[PDB]
Structure formats: C-alpha cells, structure tokens
C-alpha cells in the first residue's frame, strides 16, 4: 500500500521527505543527550554534600585548571547553551515539518486542480462542485498533515526508545516497575475508554446530525408554520430531539476527559513512587543516584507529550492515511481529453440527428436537428431545465453526442477538431462569478494582457463610460463576483470578457434573468450591435427579448419547434 | 454589561452556576491537599525516626501498627486512595461543566429558535438561512462554551493562587526565583511571540480567503475554461497566489510552535536549577528538603496545564464573550405579531389596488386590482422573478402590505384576524422539504397522531397504493428529503401535509418545474378534482397546466392583465 505514496512526490518533494526522517532521528538523539547531560552536572553539584566520594571534583576537576565552584558554574552554563541550542534546533525541526507539509499542500494540489480541469465537461458535470472542490483542496490538507504526522511519529517513537534506553542505563527495578506501570496505563485507556470515546463520540455525530437536520428542515416550512400558526407539533419534536442531542453530547465530553484526568492521578502516583524506592533500598548515593532521580523527572517531562503524540499520529494514520492515498491516484490518474486537429466554419452548422441525454438521465432530445448559417443570431426558448442549456451544451464543443454528428461545412464535430472549435465562443453567464481582482484581469481571464485588444473590447462592450469614474480605473478591485459591480455591470464585463477572445459565435445562456426591466433591452441592443459581425445563440427564458433574432427555436418535450 | 445575563438564565440556571463556581474553588483545595499530602508521606518514608518524636507522630505508632515499615506502606495506599479519589473527583467536576455547557446549548437554542419561528414573515425573508442557523446553533455554541471558560478561569486562577501559596510555605529563595523566572517568561513570550502569532495568523485568515476565492471562482467558470482552452493564464494567477499562500501558512504553524518548544528548554532549566540550587545550599536534611523538590515537581507539573487553561479561557473571554452576549438582547428580545380575533370567508377576496414592496426596495406593483370569489380556482402567470409568489403571499395572511386592503367578505385582514385567516390556508410546496421520520408525522406536520382525520388524508392524497408497497407503510421513515420516494410521491405528501390542516385556500407556488409532464400531469389532474369544494391560488411557472382554471391573472410589470 506504500507504493501509492512515491507516485505523487517528486525530487523537490522526496528529498525533503528524507531530510525530515533523518532529522526526526537526530532530534531524538539531541533530546536524549540534553537529558543525559544533566546527570554529570547534577552529580557534581550533589557531590558537595558528601564532600568527596569519587573522582568527581577534588580528584577530577584538577585535570584542566580553575577551582571547584568555577567548574560547576561553567558546567552550568554549559548545560544552558545546550538547552537553548536544543530549544532552537527542536524549533527548526518543527519548522521543517510545517515547511514540508504545507509545501506539499501546494505542490500536490497544483496538479489535481489541473486534472479536474482537463476532464470532459460531462465528467465535470456528473459530480457536483461541492465535491470536486474537496477533491482538489480537502484531500491535500489531510495527506500533508498525515506525512507530517508520520515524520513526527518517527521522531517521537525514536525519542521514546533512546530515552527509555537512558533510563534503563540507570536503574533496574524502577525502570521495570515504570515500564510495567506505563504499559498498564497504555491499556484500559486504549481498550476500555478508547472504545467508549467513539461509542459516545459517534453518537454525538449522530446527535449533531439529528439536531442540525431537523433544525434546517424546520426553517424551510416557516411559511407553512405561519399558516399552521400552531408550533406545538414542531417544538414538541424539537425539544425532545435537542434533549436527545444534549446528553449524547455530554457523554462525549466526559469520556474524552477521563483518560487525562486518570493519567494525572497516575502520573502523581508513578512520580512519588520513583522516590519511595530510592530511599528504602540502600543505594543511598547522595550524588550518584540522587542525580539520577532528576533524570527520571526530566525524562518523564519529555515523555508525557511523547506518548500523547504517538496515539495522535496513530489515529491520524487511521482516520486519514489509507482512506486518502487510494482516492488520490484514481482522481489524479483520471483520463483527460486528447485531440489534435483544426476545422473551418464559413457556411452552416448542421446538427444532423443529435439524440442526447446526460449519462444516467433520460433523453431530452432524440433526433434533434437544425442548422445555423454564419450570422443567423438564433434563440432557444424553453421551459427551464428541459433541454435548452443541454442542447446548447451539445452545440458547443462540450458533451460528445450519442448518435449525432453536428456538421460544420459538411464536416463532423468530433474530438479531433473540438479543441479548435471551442476557441471561437464566449459565454457571458449574466450571473457571472468574478474573482476579487482588477476588472482587466477579469476581462482577459488572467491570460496576461494585450491592451491593444482590451480598449477596443471595452469600447464595444460600452464600458468606456464606466472605466473613467473608477478610482483605480481598469485596475480597481472587482470585489468577489459582484458586490462592487451590479448585475448589468457584470453583464458588460462578461460581454467584454467574451469579446476579448475575438470570437465568431456568442452564446448567452439565460442572459436576461438577473436584471431589472430597464437594464435588459439596452444591454441586448449593445450586444446586437457588436454581434453584427458575428453569430449568436440565445437561451432566453422569456419571449420578445429576441425579436431581432431571425430564428427562434423553441424546445418543448424532446422536439425542437421554430417560432419567428 | 452583566445585566444581559440574568435576563436569559432563570433560577435553576443560577443554582447550577453557584453549584459549579463553588466547586471551582473547592477543586483547588483538593489538588493542593493531594500535593500537600506528599511531603508528610515522603518525609516519614525516609526518616522512620519521626514516628517516635514530635507532638504529632508518637502514639499512633503503637496503635495496632507494631513496626514502622507497616505504617508507611499504609500511608502509601492512603495517598493512592486519595489520588484515585481525586481522579474520580476531578472526573465528576469535568462532568458537570460539560453538562452545564451542552445543557445551555439546548436550553438557550430552544428559546432562540422559538423566537425566530414567531417573527413576522417579512423579517424572516430578509435574512438568509445560514445566518439564522448559526444564530440559533453557532451563537448558542459559543456562549455555552464561554460560560464554562469563565468558571474554569476562576477555578484555574484559584489553583494557581493556593499552589503558589503552598510553594511559598516550603521555600523562600526558590519560589522567589521561580516567580521572577516565570514573570520573565510570562513576559517576552506574551509581547514578542504573541504579536507574530497574529501577524502571521490573521494573515492566514487573509491568505486562506484570497486562495479559496480565486479557486472557487474558476469552478463556476469551468464552461469558459473549456472555451479558453489555455489554462496558463489561470495557473499563472494560481501558482503565484499559492506560492504566496504557502509561506503565509508555514510561518503560522511555526510561530504557534515556538512557545512550547522554547517552553521545554525553560522547564528543563527551571528543574535542574531547583535541585542544584537546593543541593548547593546546606539545608541537606537528606529528606527534609530533598522531599520538597518532589512537591515543586508535582506543583509545576500541575501548573503547566494550569497556565494553559487560564489563557485558553482568557482567549475564550475575548474572541467570543462580548461578541455573543450583546447579540442576544438583539435576538431574544425580538418582537412578534399580536392580535386576538376571528375571521370568516364566504363571499369574495377583493384585493383592490395592492401596491407592494419590501423593506427598503422599490414597488413591484403600483395599483394592482383583482377579486377572488370562493371557489374561483385562479392562477398567476408571470416570469421567474417578476413577483408571482409575492402577490399570492399577499392574498393569504402573510405579508403585511403597504397600501393593500386584501378584503375578505368586505372585512379587513389585520393582525387580530391574520392568525385565524392563516389557519384556513395550506401551501403544498412542490419541492417539499421532508424530515427523516414516519410519513404519518410528515402529514401531521408533527401535530401528534390523528388516525380519525389522518387515515382519510392518505385516502385523499392517493398514497394508499404507495403505502402498500412501503415496508413500514404509514410509519415508514421517509428517509430525509426523498429516499426511495419519487418526485410525484413527494408531491402526494405535500398535498397530504396541507390537507391535514383542513384549510380553505390552497396555494401551489411553482408546482411545476422538476418532474416529467406525465409524473406531474397525474398530480395536476388530481389537484383540479379535489379543489372543487375550496378555492385555490396557483403560481404556475409554465403554461397549459391551468386548463380548467376559471381565472388567470397575469401580472406584468406593475399592472395586472387578465388571461383566461
């Protein structure tokens, strides 16, 4: 299952993964030596009580220079450089963890967004956007923190090992009683409480669902609630379900606190018991072993979050991990459209027996036929969600037809020339969603700039009377989609964005549904003038907004009728 | 600002608040007693001779005890009994806190949800659902978890008060050094790291929105992305924004880890200092003062989460707190409709010059005239945004008009009888939002059971041939909005739900939009036959569905023309 990991990471990503793995081991050796460095220093300081017992001062300090109180201070500041050094080195390690995790958050997510951009429009249509968005930004945060949790896990299990080795290097019955008492505490909390952690933890997820769902549902029938006027039948189901949500939630916040509270009374008991074994058993080394009792203290102080993070990354390697890496390939190994070829449009746009519906949806057409000569300016009158936008999705390069040909100058519209065919069409989606940046980038759609191609477009899209009064001019921040741009201002910008492509076919797609009565016809004429040199397809949800359209195709229940 | 508190909470919520706050003070004495029980037990475990000296430990030595080693062991189990008692004690305290917080998460949200359910229909229309939803379950969530933080804060500052006082009794120079060293580390970290925590932490909130908005904008323009074909212009604005979001996130999760990593070096250095400083000073009682080292160890080990929970509750008392309490006097003290009277309907529903607009908008009508006789079966033909549902919501008891009479048998529809007139109308929404419960509860609208009238409702809503194939039948948990229920069967419940009200006027409101003509025509024919004994206002969105409609009022752009 590990083979799916190396498939995503590259040389700037893989080499960084190894650096953290070695540093995870080295940071462990740094912590151990930082602990072990207390033992000599505090042996010599505690050796002052027993005067002289071993060659540790009067019989050891006389090997370099200086007196006793000077070598105990120098050893003291020697302890505090190593600890400030560690405090910086351990901080740098926890910085490389974030630099690698959040750097892969970008390096990985940069490609999945391209994958869902290259799939056919039908494959982007079958899955909703509230799912693809999570497929290109939700999975990456989980994988990044999972690899970081994996590297931090290696650092920790290493810290635990060699620090336990340092404890075993000191005492026998204690480190034995300590290891036994530690693994006894690793139990119960992981086998009797950890099940109840989710036994009352997923019942809280059950209760939160049972509360949010009936709360959102209750707000929708507010009209029907005002008609009923009696809210008793609704609040008698709300108070009992909220009270069902209440205790199902308090049992989660109770069993999530028992482990640490019990671990505190334990930690106290395993602490004072590290003492009751030293004074009773006659290893009474006022400095030899009283130094080591401080080593057990510091070791435990470095060991409590040491054991906590292991279970944290363990749950992170089960909650995440195997459920994230598999979907990754499948979503990024996904297939994308491949076609090379050109096509020319000078005569008419034959359709030739389309017959189409979505993947698992019924056929909203069946033997749908029409043709569009250059410059007809046709329309598509329909009943909303019946098959207008579906048919126009078929006319354009999107949606490969079932039994259709869609001829262009007696030449079929297929994947070879659909790439070049998609270039000469704008969209202008009336309720156009802009991104918070300059309107110039919103017209160019980010594809750099061309200035000599923007002023003419703005002048044609009747935005010239709009750029003058803006504070930053063409550089003013558009503010999300609209906000700073009202509906028809977004229309003019959408028209400008389409005109910037220098197209030959323009499609409206309900371009009159998000405006007032006065703002529609002016924009429609402002489009009719700049479409005199072009063609046009209109998906009007109403009649008389097309009038100047020489063709009016009304799609009913599968068949295409013609009006004006 | 504290006066806003007692207005919401009652007497029980005050007896329980004192229950928690006195416990908050007492749990500090239990911890200190659990720590202060160590120094005697350890000063007697080491120096056995204390059990035949001092006016405190002499006679108990020869009261059933016999030797000295037997009583010190007894003292040990007495401590672990106290520590298991203390662990159970703290588990009960942290059990009442979560019971009070998640208890007020229900008690408050129940009142706020009841308040938003009884306001006028116009006040509920102006604000979106996610705002109200978070106003009745997100705001309650923050205030609930805030009160517990204040209690825990006072409990916490208390345990720091008497644990620091217990340390002062033990030592003079050591506690003084620790306090100076603490308030030196309480400084620097709160004024040098804390700025960069938010200087790179609220920059994260900045970069996250600036990274999501340009990503979520591209998904809505995926159609135009396929047309442009070139993604380099989209990815040159994505890679440059992501390489900025990358570093903007690595520095946040780094500076949020600088404290505790520097804190480790602090904890290490303040430990070996204590024992070295206490081993250089010649108070070496072998046990008298070297046991006090263990009290300092247990005191600090109890003071690390002690310092963490104080700032956690202080952040909870600033991040939330003042932003929640004020917005409840402005959410709970909300005003609601009045009136107490009855109304009768038997002749005509004269509208007579409606003219209506919302709070601060324009008027969609300006003189709108019609009249509805009992049993006229009228319809409203308009556009997708003209005001088709507005006029009908004006005819019925909803929507207090600006200049409209809404006469009912030459009697005015006002607040005294709007309740009674709302009682005699049923909505039957086509895209009905069902709740995951038995279909009987769905039809009753939660108003308990009623097999008498309710059994007749199923026979009227022609669900009987669908209840038969249903596994649980009338008690079938419908399965959220629409599990195995097709669109037509959802409509049958929509009719059944309003039929249980025993109404007099039936609304439809776009009862044709998302179902094939057949699966709806069978429902539309069912409607016209069961509407003979009542009146009905249809807000049809498409034509040919109002064949047998005797009246068809078409509202254009302010005036009302009549069709069939």
């Amino acid at each position: 299952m590990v083979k799916k990991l190396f498939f995503i990471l590259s040389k700037e990503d893989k080499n960084f993964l190894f650096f953290l793995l070695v540093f995870s081991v080295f940071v462990s050796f740094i912590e151990t030596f930082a602990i072990s460095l207390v033992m000599p220093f505090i042996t010599l300081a505690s050796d002052f009580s027993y005067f002289d017992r071993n060659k540790y001062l009067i019989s050891l300090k006389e090997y370099l220079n200086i007196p006793v109180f000077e070598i105990i201070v120098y050893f003291g500041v020697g302890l505090i450089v190593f600890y400030v050094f560690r405090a910086l080195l351990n901080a740098y390690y926890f910085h490389l963890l974030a630099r690698f995790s959040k750097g892969r958050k970008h390096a990985i997510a940069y490609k999945v967004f391209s994958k869902f951009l290259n799939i056919n429009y039908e494959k982007f249509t079958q899955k909703n956007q509230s799912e693809i968005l999570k497929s290109i930004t939700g999975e990456v945060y989980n994988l990044s923190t999972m690899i970081s949790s994996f590297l931090l896990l290696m650092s920790e299990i290493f810290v635990v090992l060699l620090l336990y080795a340092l404890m075993l290097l000191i005492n026998y019955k204690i480190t034995l009683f300590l290891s036994i008492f530690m693994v006894l505490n690793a139990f119960i909390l992981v086998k009797i409480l950890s099940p109840i952690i989710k036994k009352a933890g997923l019942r809280r997820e059950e209760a939160m669902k049972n509360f949010f769902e009936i709360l959102n549902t209750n707000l929708n029938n507010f009209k029907f609630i005002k008609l009923k006027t009696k809210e008793d039948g609704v609040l008698s189901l709300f108070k009992a379900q909220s009270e069902a949500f209440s205790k199902a939630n308090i049992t989660n916040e109770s069993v999530a606190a028992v482990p640490r509270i019990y671990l505190e009374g334990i930690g106290f008991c395993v602490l004072v018991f590290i003492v009751v074994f030293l004074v009773l058993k006659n290893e009474s080394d006022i400095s030899g072993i009283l130094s080591t009792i401080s080593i057990f203290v510091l070791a435990l102080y470095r060991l409590m979050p040491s054991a906590n993070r292991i279970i944290t990354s363990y749950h992170d390697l089960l909650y995440y991990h195997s459920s994230l890496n598999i979907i990754y390939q499948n979503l990024r190994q996904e297939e994308e459209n491949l076609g090379e070829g050109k096509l020319s449009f000078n005569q008419e746009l034959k359709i030739c027996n389309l017959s189409f519906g979505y993947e698992g949806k019924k056929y909203l057409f069946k033997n749908l036929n029409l043709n569009i000569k250059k410059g007809e300016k046709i329309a598509f009158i329909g009943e909303s969600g019946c098959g207008k936008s579906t048919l126009v999705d078929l006319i354009i390069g999107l949606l490969k037809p079932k039994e259709g040909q869609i001829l262009i100058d007696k030449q079929e519209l297929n994947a070879s020339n659909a790439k070049n065919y998609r270039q000469k069409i704008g969209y202008i989606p009336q309720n156009i969603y802009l991104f918070n940046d300059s309107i110039a980038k919103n017209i160019t759609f980010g594809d750099a700039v061309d200035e000599e191609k923007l002023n003419k477009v703005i002048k044609q899209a009747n935005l010239e009377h709009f750029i003058k009064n803006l504070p930053q001019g063409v550089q003013t921040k558009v503010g999300d989609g609209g906000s700073n741009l009202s509906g028809g201002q977004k229309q003019r910008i959408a028209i400008a964005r389409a005109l910037y492509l220098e197209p030959e076919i323009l499609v409206l797609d309900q371009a009159t549904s998000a405006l007032d009565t006065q703002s529609e016809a002016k924009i429609m004429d402002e489009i009719y003038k700049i479409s005199k040199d072009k063609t046009m397809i209109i998906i009007a949800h109403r009649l008389s907004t097309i009038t100047q359209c020489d063709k009016v195709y009304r799609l009913e229940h599968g068949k295409l009728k013609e009006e004006k | 600002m504290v006066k806003k508190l007692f207005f919401i909470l009652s007497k029980e919520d005050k007896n329980f608040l004192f229950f928690l706050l006195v416990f908050s003070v007492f749990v500090s004495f239990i911890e200190t007693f659990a720590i202060s029980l160590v120094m005697p037990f350890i000063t007697l475990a080491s120096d056995f001779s204390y059990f035949d000296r001092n006016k405190y430990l002499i006679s108990l030595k020869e009261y059933l005890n016999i030797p000295v080693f037997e009583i010190i062991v007894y003292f040990g189990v007495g401590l672990i009994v106290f520590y298991v008692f203390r662990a159970l004690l703290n588990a009960y305290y942290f059990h009442l806190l979560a019971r009070f917080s998640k208890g007020r998460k229900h008690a408050i949200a129940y009142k706020v949800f009841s308040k938003f359910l009884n306001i006028n229909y116009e006040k509920f229309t102006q604000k979106n659902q996610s705002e109200i939803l978070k106003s009745i379950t997100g705001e309650v969530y923050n205030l609930s978890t805030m009160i517990s933080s204040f209690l825990l804060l006072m409990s916490e500052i208390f345990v720091v008060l008497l644990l620091y006082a217990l340390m002062l009794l033990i030592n003079y120079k050591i506690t003084l050094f620790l306090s100076i060293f603490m308030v030196l580390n309480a400084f620097i970290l709160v004024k040098i790291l804390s700025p960069i925590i938010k200087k790179a932490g609220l920059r994260r909130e900045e970069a996250m929105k600036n990274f999501f908005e340009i990503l979520n904008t591209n998904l809505n323009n995926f159609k135009f992305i396929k047309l442009k074909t070139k993604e380099d212009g989209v990815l040159s604005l994505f890679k440059a924004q992501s390489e900025a979001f990358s570093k903007a996130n690595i520095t946040n999760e780094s500076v949020a880890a600088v404290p505790r990593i520097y804190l480790e070096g602090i904890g290490f250095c303040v430990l070996v200092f204590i024992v070295v400083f206490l081993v250089l000073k010649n108070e070496s009682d072998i046990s008298g003062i070297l046991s006090t080292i263990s009290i300092f160890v247990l005191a600090l080990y109890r003071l690390m989460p002690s310092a963490n929970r104080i700032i956690t509750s202080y952040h909870d008392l600033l991040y939330y707190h003042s932003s929640l309490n004020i917005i409840y006097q402005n959410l709970r003290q909300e005003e609601e409709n009045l009136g107490e009277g009855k109304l009768s309907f038997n002749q005509e529903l004269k509208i007579c010059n409606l003219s209506f607009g919302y709070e601060g908008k324009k008027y969609l009508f300006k003189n709108l005239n019609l009249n509805i006789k009992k049993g006229e079966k009228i319809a409203f033909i308009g556009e997708s945004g003209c005001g088709k549902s507005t006029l009908v919501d004006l005819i019925i008891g909803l929507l207090k008009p600006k200049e409209g009479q809404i006469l009912i048998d030459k009697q005015e529809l006002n607040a005294s009888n709007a309740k009674n007139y709302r009682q005699k109308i049923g909505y039957i929404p086509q895209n009905i939002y069902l709740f995951n419960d038995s279909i009987a509860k769905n039809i009753t609208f939660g108003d308990a059971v009623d097999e008498e009238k309710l059994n007749k409702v199923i026979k009227q809503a022609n669900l009987e041939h669908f209840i038969k194939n249903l596994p649980q039948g009338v008690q079938t948990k419908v399965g959220d909005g629409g599990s195995n229920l097709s669109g037509g069967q959802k409509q049958r419940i929509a009719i059944a739900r309003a039929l249980y009200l025993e109404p007099e006027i039936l609304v439809l409101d776009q009862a044709t939009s998302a179902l094939d003509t057949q699966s709806e025509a069978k429902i539309m024919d069912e409607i016209y036959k069961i509407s003979k004994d009542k009146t009905m206002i249809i807000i049809a969105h498409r034509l040919s569905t109002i064949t047998q409609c005797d009246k068809v009022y078409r509202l254009e752009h302010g005036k009302l023309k009549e069709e069939k």
Partner: nanobody
Amino acid sequence: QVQLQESGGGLVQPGGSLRLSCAASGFTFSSYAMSWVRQAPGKGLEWVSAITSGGGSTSYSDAVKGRFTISRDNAKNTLYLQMNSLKPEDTAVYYCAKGYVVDFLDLAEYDSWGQGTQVTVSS
C-alpha cells in the same frame, strides 16, 4: 437585509464645511468598496464619489473635483464625505449605496437607501 442609514447633512449656508456620515449594517463593511449618489429635483440620478476596500484609492467627478475628500472608517462602519461650497445642484440628497454605483444602469439599484439628509443650500 442590508440597511444603511446616513444622517449628518443639514442646511448651512455655502462656502463652509459639511461632513456626512453614512452608517451601514448587514455585510462585511471592509470587503465592499463604497460610493455615493444623489437624485436631483425632476432629474434622474447623478453620481458623486467612490473609494476602494482599503481606502487607499479615491475617485471623484468633474463637477465636484477638487472640492471633497472621502475617508473610510472601517472601525465604526461609517463612510464619510467632506463637502465644501454648494451649487444649484449640490442638493440632490446624498444617500450612500453599496458597491460601485457609477454607470447608467447600476444606479437603478436599492443597495442601501435609507431616509437621507436634504441639503438644499441656496444663495
């Protein structure tokens, strides 16, 4: 539920100072750029000034150029506008509006409104 209420412009003789304060509610005040407009007696509408989200880029019109200085206070959620000298047109009641109201179509939008302060400063 966007509801704005500006109230700080009374009749004071020309050649002096008059700062109007527009209060806003119902939206993130900082993310939205703001503007000003006015409706003349008998005439349709007429634009005044504009400003960005950060308040670091200003805009005015030729009939009021070099006369006003616009400031944004993102603390009290208020949009100020200093005024000096009044013409038989600087009267049309300055409302507030939300985003960029400046073209001849996005003016027919009730993005704010709210009473208003009449400032008919004649000779």
